[PDB]
Design a protein around this ligand. Structure first.
Ligand SMILES: [Cl-]
Ligand SMILES: [Cu+2]
Ligand SMILES: [Cu+2]
Ligand SMILES: [Cu+2]
Ligand SMILES: [Cu+2]
Ligand SMILES: [Cu+2]
Ligand SMILES: [Cu+2]
Lengths: 316, 317, 316
């Protein structure tokens, strides 16, 4: 089917951690960018308007661009950049399946590294794996890093001379992340993305993960892991069988990454919270204002197209 | 079988490198912590006493805690911390097989990153791989990094603003590491752990490694490597066939990691020394003061239980 | 067969980037060092003469040194160093197949980290994979990093206290790299090397990579990837089916690595350029002064031996 979407690029500010507001270039004014969810074989048309003061593009990472290389989104290679105030239309066929993503390809070190110019592109295969047919909850986790020194400073950051001192999943640092709420018997598909410039060692307490896909494509030899290393550009899909009721923390195991501006705890941390587990008064998230779509789990159930999320929207 | 162990957490100082003494929180006053070696299906009880000035927990990394999540050892999630001077008992069934480990889960960036709060937990499968039944030597290598600026200062370190300038296997930096001594025909199982906050590219000269397990679980498709990348939290088990007599260096291939305080050589370096090879006068480790249990290989032959090692023990104040 | 080669170590200066010349110890006065290409079972002899002011060795990474451990090239372990002005002969049997490499093993943090003391060693199996039979182009990509503060001064660099601020493939930083020119129907073997001290996430636009070998040895279970993480010491061989005509960028996806001295663009970046695709006026590499052997692809067709390349030579 033909899938036509309109995206904008906006100058907005988001809250990454307590005390850290960050100026970003948000697709549809949000970080992560909108979820794009389509079927294998769909013809995609994206009309992009640049409402920022700088040039950008959108590269569709994982999309082959078979006979459509001029929609690959690389400035000086496949197109001239999209200048401030201008528009550009991308057209491609979604013939590559799985967990893909999209991001700006101008000034990548800054724009993708610290300005949040990325989002998920999920292409449903015609032939999912047997285990994928058992999935009851689909979870998107996009990891990135932030340099507090350039929080207020478009045009700076993302160099070896900068210090990445905050770390996140879906643009939040713990405790501003959200729990992953499950029920006993759930079969959870988690899609990890190396969105930023860091490496993340994602570890699930209480469960092993079956690693089923690398960069969206199914492995002939899937393998179990309790810690999955995710590096820039990569995606890994795993399955967790939710067969062990408790509260089980789930986080980046890189020691310096569980900090926020030099203090602990912070970073890419969530908790696998099973329904019906009694809540102790000392539980860190006992009074959580819950967002059920923090990992796009609700949007992933609502059909094919483009999905904004109010929780990811920044302020103008 | 029910296996009950008593462990303490102690404030001690260890020698990581020549000219680098480091204040740590050592399980039983040592880094690495004691080897815990049990069988699949055992019921494990660990009574922990905190003899330090700061709160800690023990998380059992790889242990599912099937129906025992309150023993997972995570502060503010599964328990309140073990305060200074207090005790706490962990109970869990070892139903997850393989190379596991344990570490503190309080102030992790510092306690695990630079205070040596970790040790190995080996769970023997009831049905090991055929290749594991050929093994004649079992070897534990726990890699970590150290920040010299906070060596003498509990309560600091483990942040992006600190500089990790020393590197180790089993808490020692070359030349204070020990050789891996083998003889022709040995079948060596090596278990790599990303214990600290660094990434380590472990390269064996003279041999390929058959990578057989990831995080303790056997791969359906094992593969050969001469360099295995080990990142925080991960474990890899490999097999080396010791069929090539020589002196073969075995080290972290990350260029900056073969230094110590800006000087070279240093870092996670050992040598696979074959017994039959005549020793040259210029060999760096000629007349080495040898510790046969530096990789826990002797402890791993002594049956199920918990094993301290004096080679790893630190000095009390 | 017995194959005997003569190599020197020279003090030369290479151009790594615009704004970065670098003092290096080049094998045969070039970085990367000469391609050594032999067949499984060959008896290799390399006579090395040290024409520099400092001691060196050559370690043959991946070579087992079966019955020849004294040729392993490790100072204080298998030999005393090759002192300034002296010579030394290595002899070994190439019984280990695949993508290997060689590098100095004296003061490795500096000499391999920033002085370019490395090159490729390719051992052809007597029995190649079926997949390798279809290969029409062979490509070598050796990634490394550079510290500008020590560009002029042998005896410093390669420590945690230094800043790596330039990044390269085959010792050039974009735009001084070269395109990978292919024709539709090509089957391209790419051999990635972690030659320096960095981690590199190599991402091919427009194509998936079939990962066929790890450290030169064939995987029982090959897998597709669009991003391949290459760390120090490692090699990965991949196959790309050149079935998608366009201009497709091919680069390190680690955000900070696509910079040069704090500026973007730079780093390990090439472009898969298909023959016959019209060149746009704004294409960054329009009228490029092209080197068809920048990835050793021409040398790799010339049989067994040691092959220098003028494009890699430094100046005295
Ligand atoms: Cl022997
Ligand atoms: Cu942009
Ligand atoms: Cu891409
Ligand atoms: Cu602790
Ligand atoms: Cu854990
Ligand atoms: Cu050298
Ligand atoms: Cu080697």
């Amino acid at each position: 089917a033909e899938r036509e979407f309109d995206m904008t690029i906006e100058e907005v500010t988001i809250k990454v951690a307590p005390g850290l507001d960050y100026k970003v270039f948000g697709f549809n004014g949000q970080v992560p960018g909108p979820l794009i969810h389509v079927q294998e074989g769909d013809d995609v048309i994206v009309n992009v308007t640049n409402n920022t003061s700088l040039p950008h593009t959108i590269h569709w990472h994982g999309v082959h661009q078979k006979g459509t290389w001029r929609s690959d989104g690389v400035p000086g290679v496949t197109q001239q950049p999209i200048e401030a105030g201008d528009s550009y239309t991308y057209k491609f066929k979604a013939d590559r399946i799985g967990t893909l993503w999209y991001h700006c390809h101008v000034n990548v070190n800054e724009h993708v590294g610290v300005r949040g110019m990325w989002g998920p592109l999920i292409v449903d295969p015609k032939q999912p794996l047997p285990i994928e047919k058992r999935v009851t909850k689909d979870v998107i986790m996009m990891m990135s890093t932030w340099e507090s020194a350039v929080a207020d400073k478009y045009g700076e950051g993302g160099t070896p001379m900068n210090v990445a001192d905050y770390f996140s999943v879906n643009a939040k640092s713990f405790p501003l992340t959200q729990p992953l709420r499950v029920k006993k018997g759930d079969v959870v598909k988690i899609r990890f993305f190396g969105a930023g410039g860091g490496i993340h060692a994602m570890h699930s307490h209480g469960h092993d993960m079956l690693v089923t896909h690398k960069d969206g494509l199914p492995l002939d030899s899937p393998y179990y892991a309790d810690t999955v290393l995710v590096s820039p550009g990569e995606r890994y899909d795993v399955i967790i069988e939710a067969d062990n009721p408790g509260r089980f923390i789930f986080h980046d195991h890189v020691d310096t990454h569980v900090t926020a501006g030099g203090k602990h705890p912070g970073g890419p941390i969530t908790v696998i919270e099973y329904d019906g587990v009694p809540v102790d008064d000392w539980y860190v998230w006992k009074d959580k204002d819950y967002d059920p779509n923090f990992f796009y789990s609700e949007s992933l159930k609502q059909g094919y197209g483009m999905f904004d999320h109010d929780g990811f929207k920044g302020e103008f």
